Design a protein around this nucleic acid. Sequence first.
RNA 1: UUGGGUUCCGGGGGGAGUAUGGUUGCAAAGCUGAAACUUAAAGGAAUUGACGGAAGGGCACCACCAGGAGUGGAGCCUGCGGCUUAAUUUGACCAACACGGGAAACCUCACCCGGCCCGGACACGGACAGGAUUGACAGAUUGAUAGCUCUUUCUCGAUUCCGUGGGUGGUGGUGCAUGGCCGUUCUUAGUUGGUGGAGCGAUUUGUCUGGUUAAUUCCGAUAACGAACGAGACUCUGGCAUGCUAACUAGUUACGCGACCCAGCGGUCGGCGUAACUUCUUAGAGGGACAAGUGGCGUUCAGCCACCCGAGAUUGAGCAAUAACAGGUCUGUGAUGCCCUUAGAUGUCCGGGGCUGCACGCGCGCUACACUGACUGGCUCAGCGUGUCCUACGCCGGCAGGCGCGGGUAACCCGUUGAACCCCAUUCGUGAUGGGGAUCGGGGAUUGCAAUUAUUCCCCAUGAACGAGGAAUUCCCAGUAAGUGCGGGUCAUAAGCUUGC
RNA 2: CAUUGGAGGGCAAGUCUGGUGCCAGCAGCCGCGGUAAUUCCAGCUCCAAUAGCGUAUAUUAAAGUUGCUGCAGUUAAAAAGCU
Lengths: 56, 63
Amino acid sequence: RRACYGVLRFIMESGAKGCEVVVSGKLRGQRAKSMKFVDGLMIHSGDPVNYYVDTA
Amino acid sequence: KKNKHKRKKVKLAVLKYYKVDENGKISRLRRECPSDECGAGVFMASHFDRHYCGKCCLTYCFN
RNA sequence: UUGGGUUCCGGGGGGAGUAUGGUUGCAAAGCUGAAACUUAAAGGAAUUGACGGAAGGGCACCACCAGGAGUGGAGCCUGCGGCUUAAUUUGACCAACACGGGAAACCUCACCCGGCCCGGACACGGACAGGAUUGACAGAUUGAUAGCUCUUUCUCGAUUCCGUGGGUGGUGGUGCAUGGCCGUUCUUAGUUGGUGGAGCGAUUUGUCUGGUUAAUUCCGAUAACGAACGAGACUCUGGCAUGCUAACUAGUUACGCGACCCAGCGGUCGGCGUAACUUCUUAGAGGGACAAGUGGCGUUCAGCCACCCGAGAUUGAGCAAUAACAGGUCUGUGAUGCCCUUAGAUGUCCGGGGCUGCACGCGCGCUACACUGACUGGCUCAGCGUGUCCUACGCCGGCAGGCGCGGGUAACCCGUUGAACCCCAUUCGUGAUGGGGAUCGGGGAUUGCAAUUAUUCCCCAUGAACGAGGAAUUCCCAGUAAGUGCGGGUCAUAAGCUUGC
RNA sequence: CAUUGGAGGGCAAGUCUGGUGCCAGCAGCCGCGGUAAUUCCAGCUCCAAUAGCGUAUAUUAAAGUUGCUGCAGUUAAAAAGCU
Ligand SMILES: [Mg+2]
Ligand SMILES: [Mg+2]
Ligand SMILES: [Mg+2]
Ligand SMILES: [Mg+2]
Ligand SMILES: [Mg+2]
Ligand SMILES: [Mg+2]
Ligand SMILES: [Mg+2]
Ligand SMILES: [Mg+2]
Ligand SMILES: [Zn+2]
């Protein structure tokens, strides 16, 4: 929760329009729980997904 | 069902393939190797009927 | 910030307004009224979902209507259950079942029957140059030309071996420990914060009475305001440009020869060569359509209907939200936790078998039941796309095929891809027929290490059900359904499949 | 030679290690355990109060859950049918 927030802050401070950090897996316990950190704009559909967002 | 034992080796002593007499004698007891690969070193074997080269896999059926 | 007077009455739920006793009543019953035992909740109000054989709106050929083609009946192909087996490896039950790109001869491959191998790093200790150890012909042995073992003796020479320690491998287990990727709810229009307001709060408003739209699409209303995603835009593609850029790896026309026909600055020529050119071919750049125009309808808004003009007045896809699901995949992974095994191995190789086994049930398909046809000729038309394997031509063979020569790493060669149905002419004649081609005998080629449980291919014979398919049910509205053939994937051999044309 | 109880939450104190696998067991209450148990059985640690500390039962406060101070009685338990 602390590491993802600092990466989230470091992207928006660096001059980005919007970013998503998604961390899925065994976080607390043995059940798989996803965790998604969003701020700003984020497109999902269409051709501009091909060159406005980069994924890793 | 009993397993198969492996090839237990025979564990012999020194070679002793050399005769020596009258204070300095040359005698090649086991046979020669006509191959130029193992010549002057490797002997041949001595079975009950044949001689055999342990390297070049060559035997002579002396009948 | 708890006191006007006064009556009755409740104390978790059940047992239970039951049992007993008294009393009232003709009776039915009323009144009064326990306990043992049992139990961690029962309950009230409100909120959000879910569901309703509740009502309003609206929508979809994975829904119906009007229909079409069917499937379900038949034979076969192939997948799943079951049975059987030494083993018939296994995953999956709308959203599993021609699925795992899963068309398995061996390999694949896990399963079975057997036989080798170490590919057990490294660390320590034991051994050991008087030698650690390694490989072997010939016999015995073995499915085996595995020195695997045994007889037998020769060979390498520190690489190894023995012992604990510790690693490594695994298409082993676990998808209910997970990653990733898919699929689905969910092809519909839906979802969310900020600040403000309303509530003790969960929450709500925003995100709506109404109109409109494919759409939470807009107009408009309004304790909301301003935004965000999805929709839309966008991308590819379809359809038009006698305008542009451009062409010996694209053509056309003109012309020059050349064949042939019957005389012309005639007719045909995918005969040959070069002059202008881009119409046709290719593929770039721009253009074009916006509900723009007209008329209606509509709050005159949003929009809708019709018509003109036009190639076109909704072409088809791809991408695709929040929240999820114990959806699938550990058998895609040197993605992976934990567990199991780890040398007589669940590692790995080799050989053989199995994955095809057949009282039976189901799913996706194929070929048919014929005359709107089959047969035998004749004639004449594609488009994607692939190729170091694709193939031209010449000989040989009746056929599958063979043998020679060439071309193409490809707008260059195959290839002007001379495709089917169709079209025209024949024979048949309503008879399970010359419809149908299952089953099966015999021969012939090819691929491959190997064709048996027929790999395919070809020939000759054999000639089964089937005369339109019960109850059921699938898919579909325009170049669509259906008929019809051709590529690609898989592929040494190769399509009844799938994906494209 | 300092015990007695504990360590999921109430409630001070561990997501330690080993065993067990809805078994044995714990647990006042909610609960835990069906193969990675923060709860069982043990070791390690830690906490609490300490020459004392658990446990059973009566009882008082907590209890404005008996209400004089001070409770409720529309729908949660409940105002008699009416005078
Ligand atoms: Mg009072
Ligand atoms: Mg009570
Ligand atoms: Mg406690
Ligand atoms: Mg008391
Ligand atoms: Mg008090
Ligand atoms: Mg009370
Ligand atoms: Mg009541
Ligand atoms: Mg009353
Ligand atoms: Zn020799």
